[PDB]
Design an enzyme around this catalytic site. Sequence first.
Site, mmCIF file in Angstrom:
data_model
loop_
_atom_site.group_PDB
_atom_site.id
_atom_site.type_symbol
_atom_site.label_atom_id
_atom_site.label_comp_id
_atom_site.label_asym_id
_atom_site.label_seq_id
_atom_site.Cartn_x
_atom_site.Cartn_y
_atom_site.Cartn_z
ATOM 1 N N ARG A 21 108.211 -26.087 78.062
ATOM 2 C CA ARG A 21 108.122 -24.692 78.286
ATOM 3 C C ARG A 21 107.228 -23.938 77.228
ATOM 4 O O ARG A 21 106.595 -22.911 77.601
ATOM 5 C CB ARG A 21 109.523 -24.087 78.591
ATOM 6 C CG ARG A 21 109.931 -24.311 79.955
ATOM 7 C CD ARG A 21 111.237 -23.682 80.147
ATOM 8 N NE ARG A 21 112.375 -23.905 79.511
ATOM 9 C CZ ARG A 21 113.233 -24.715 79.330
ATOM 10 N NH1 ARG A 21 113.055 -25.848 80.151
ATOM 11 N NH2 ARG A 21 114.101 -25.097 78.525
ATOM 12 N N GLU A 51 123.340 -31.256 69.935
ATOM 13 C CA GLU A 51 124.770 -31.226 69.934
ATOM 14 C C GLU A 51 125.545 -32.477 69.446
ATOM 15 O O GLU A 51 126.349 -32.160 68.505
ATOM 16 C CB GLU A 51 125.276 -30.502 71.320
ATOM 17 C CG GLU A 51 126.521 -29.791 71.336
ATOM 18 C CD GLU A 51 126.973 -29.379 72.342
ATOM 19 O OE1 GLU A 51 127.973 -28.337 72.424
ATOM 20 O OE2 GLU A 51 126.467 -29.697 73.667
#
Lengths: 172, 168
Positions: free
Chosen positions: A60, A97
């Site tokens: 992106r 995470e």
Amino acid sequence: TLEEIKMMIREIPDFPKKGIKFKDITPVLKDAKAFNYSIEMLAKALEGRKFDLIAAPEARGFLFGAPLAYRLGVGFVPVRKPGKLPAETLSYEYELEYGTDSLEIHKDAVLEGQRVVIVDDLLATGGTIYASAKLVESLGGIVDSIIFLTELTFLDGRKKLDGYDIISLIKF
Amino acid sequence: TLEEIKMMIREIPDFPKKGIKFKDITPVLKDAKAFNYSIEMLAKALEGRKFDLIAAPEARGFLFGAPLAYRLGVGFVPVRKPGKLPAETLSYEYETDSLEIHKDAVLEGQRVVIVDDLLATGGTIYASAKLVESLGGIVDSIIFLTELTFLDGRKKLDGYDIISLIKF
Ligand SMILES: [Cl-]
């Protein structure tokens, strides 16, 4: 007008996983004028800064980084996921995470002394950007600044990226 | 001067596997004038053609697709590997890999130019064309920086107008 870009970003619940509200940028991209304006405001936010190259992380990132490089008359360097780059690479680990991942750059992508602006679509935790910054520095490059279309101000990306000049157009 | 671009395309042996010669366009990208020239030539090659949007299959296709879309004052649509696009997608399988496009990416009747860095066998581009047409878009033409002529991509893409800047 930036307000208008903001309202065109589609929020998608639970993508890629439950607890994340994804900022879908594709409606900005498919609209000629909104895409044009986004690139123009990125350029404008970089006025007064000195740099030689734009780097962006896959994929992106490429979507704003590459046109912005074109618009600014500078070169473009892709920062990529493992296995994508064909020539000799450097690799750098960043935090997820509950784990780690890596990003790579070509060893010849940045020359010593080159000033780099790192671009991405969205600042979340800043892990991918931190790794990109470190990849640039390992080649002797200097990170002039880091710019994003959007920033998630609840996720402490700025803290992770301490010591860098961080610019974002739309702050959530 | 396109001859110059061609000399900056680095050939890498045995990537992504043994016996495959890979065309590395990263030296073109990192050179401000070469990158600018490549985008201008791609735009010059599309002069006299009628289209509304540019589409490019991820992610190397983005590298030329997005700047070209910006240069030509049109919108850009990404065609992506499965699981990358967030909203409702249509899908297309080909020999098996798969590509996806947003349901609302292309309006019915919209004319699309498909851009990619290199034409090899033509499989992923074929899939990209079929996805555009699945939405009722019409492929105006397909454009590449480079084309490996020994690989019959043109034959695979029979019925489409194919442009490439550099032929190997
Ligand atoms: Cl041609």
